[PDB]
């Protein structure tokens, strides 16, 4: 759903992005976080994953810059060293809690992927474990090769994202939909521009066919850039121009915000692209903010390195990077507060 | 298209809709205008069609309310009683001239329609006859019955509109795309809401796949209402709420304006729906204006009736209705100037 139900979804979306805030994605599966851990010599125990999250969530002052945190499902069952549920660290700070609800990717046609997990999504939305969650996330990933992303893969993934979106909303959760364009490929920036415009517009088609409440959806999107294996160079301004044009061409006025993923880009580049895009002229209604994992927490991992002695310095790096991303979400990174 | 080419398209779009202005559609084919003529006893001669248009275009002061006029192709070859090309009447007033470029509709599947004319559209855009035109229009029509509009018909028409759009733009013309939802059918307002959201979102998909410059496209859309053969009642406020929600859900920030078609609705209702929609709250970047034929000119035809003695009163009705539509495009119809 009724009017009040819809207004709640809208309000939650706006509360997450208030005052130049963005999202800390901490939702990595054990496998994804494990690979980052192993590179740095940190063993992939549940204990180390729990401690990492606690390090993140207990950072003093983070709520000034972070409007929501995306949790992995295992993290909802976990407590701090002090016995306090990790979700309580975020509730006391007034930060919105989110749950990543996709169950990963499986192969689709030749060389491509779809995301999976819809068949019990409604059930999982109602779980008592996620009672404090007010938003969710679900990721699809688009590989780029010649002739790919195929139109079938775009349609299928967009349809999955949209079905996820409506199920979340009927359960009182604001969905973040993440149609990630995978950086690791060989493709020009021009091609990325064009395909981003195919994906984002088709996504909005599917959201609309499912009668999703658009003011209650957040879009988690890749910057428009060339692929890592390309020898094409770009700058923050060109990324800002191309990404903003793609978004003005495809995202309706009713969407409350776009939250960029860092995607394998520098922390530095992900934040500078955000600032640059927020300096661009071009009337729009949605906020342009962030939903970073790597851009926000790579520095924490590198500083911490499984050594508790390094934790404070790790938290200070998170707070400093969070500040920069928040300034950048308002186009003020060049300006002194 | 280059940067300058695109900025021209954008500027033209904005010039048409400046200061609460809208579009006078005068583009009816001989067959469409003939049927309106016959109802009122006026013979369907070329001379009478020429005189009607002259009556419209020579109305004193119309340029205050009308930013562009859509002409039928035959009208580009026609002169006033005084020997002045009819297009010069509009050029001297500073009104933008447009050309309707579709060649009508043919049958599609069972009970539905597609619009036609793409195969020589590029050629026709370059014709010397349309040299003074700076915009164009192309209409598709969506019949409603059970199970219809079909997804095939939505895709095909949206694809035709988008191909038209890019051809126009490559020729320096701002395209108006008109995905009309036909009023004459039996369907609820709720169903019209849902299908409008299917059509508008799919349209934006196709515009994006064709890499159309979105700030240089105008959308000519039906109000969301129940069908004429329905016994469902609505009011201006409900139409405003439903139509605005459909548009916020589907139309990107980059579109410069939506221009409503009157569609068989009252002149009174078409203008009151416009005013109502412009009184609604909900952040948006595009103007909400009009591209009326019937709502603006039915009164002229009824007053004139093929009798030159009635012409001045006919022109005064056009100027008065134009004023009302302009006030309504700014949400000021209740307010005294």
Swiss-Prot record, chains A, B:
It catalyses: beta-D-fructose 1,6-bisphosphate = D-glyceraldehyde 3-phosphate + dihydroxyacetone phosphate. One of its GO terms (biological process) is glycolytic process. It is an enzyme of class 4 (lyase). It comes from the Eukaryota. One of its GO terms (molecular function) is fructose-bisphosphate aldolase activity. Pathway: Carbohydrate degradation; glycolysis; D-glyceraldehyde 3-phosphate and glycerone phosphate from D-glucose: step 4/4. Keywords: Glycolysis, Lyase, Schiff base. InterPro entries: Aldolase_TIM, FBA_I. The active site is at 178 (proton acceptor), 220 (schiff-base intermediate with dihydroxyacetone-p). Substrate binds at residues 49, 137. Its EC number is 4.1.2.13. PANTHER family: FRUCTOSE-BISPHOSPHATE ALDOLASE. Belongs to the class I fructose-bisphosphate aldolase family. This is Fructose-bisphosphate aldolase. It comes from Encephalitozoon cuniculi (strain GB-M1).
């Amino acid at each position: 759903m009724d009017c009040d139900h819809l207004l709640r979804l809208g309000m939650t979306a706006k509360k997450i992005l208030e005052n130049g805030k963005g999202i800390l994605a901490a939702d990595e599966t054990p496998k994804t976080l494990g690979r980052r851990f192993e590179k740095l010599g940190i063993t992939n125990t549940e204990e180390n994953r729990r401690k990492f999250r606690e390090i993140l969530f207990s950072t003093k002052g983070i709520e000034r810059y972070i409007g929501g945190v995306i949790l992995n499902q295992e993290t909802f069952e976990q407590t701090s060293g002090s016995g306090v549920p990790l979700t309580e660290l975020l509730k006391k700070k007034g930060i919105e809690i989110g749950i990543k609800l996709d169950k990963g990717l499986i192969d689709y046609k030749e060389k491509e992927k779809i995301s999976v997990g819809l068949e019990d999504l409604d059930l999982r939305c109602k779980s008592s474990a996620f009672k404090d969650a007010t938003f969710a996330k679900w990721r699809s990933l688009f590989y780029f090769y010649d002739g790919i992303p195929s139109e079938d893969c775009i349609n299928e993934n967009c349809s999955i994202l949209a079905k996820y979106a409506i199920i979340c909303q009927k359960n009182g959760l604001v969905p973040i939909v993440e149609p990630e364009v995978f950086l690791e490929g060989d493709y020009s920036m021009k091609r990325s521009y064009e395909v981003t415009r195919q994906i984002l517009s088709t996504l909005m088609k599917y959201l609309n066919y499912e009668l999703v409440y658009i003011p209650g959806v957040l879009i988690k999107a890749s910057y428009v850039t060339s692929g890592q294996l390309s020898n094409e160079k770009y700058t923050p301004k060109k990324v800002a121009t191309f990404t903003l044009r793609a978004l003005l061409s495809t995202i309706p006025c009713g969407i409350p915000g776009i939250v960029f993923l860092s995607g394998g880009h520098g922390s530095e580049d992900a934040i500078g692209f955000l600032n640059a895009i927020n300096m661009e002229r071009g009337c729009r209604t949605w906020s342009l903010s962030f939903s970073f994992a790597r851009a926000l927490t790579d520095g924490v991992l590198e500083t911490w390195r499984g050594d508790d002695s390094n934790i404070e310095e790790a938290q200070k790096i998170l707070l400093e990077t969070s500040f920069k991303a928040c300034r950048g979400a308002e186009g003020k990174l060049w300006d002194q507060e």
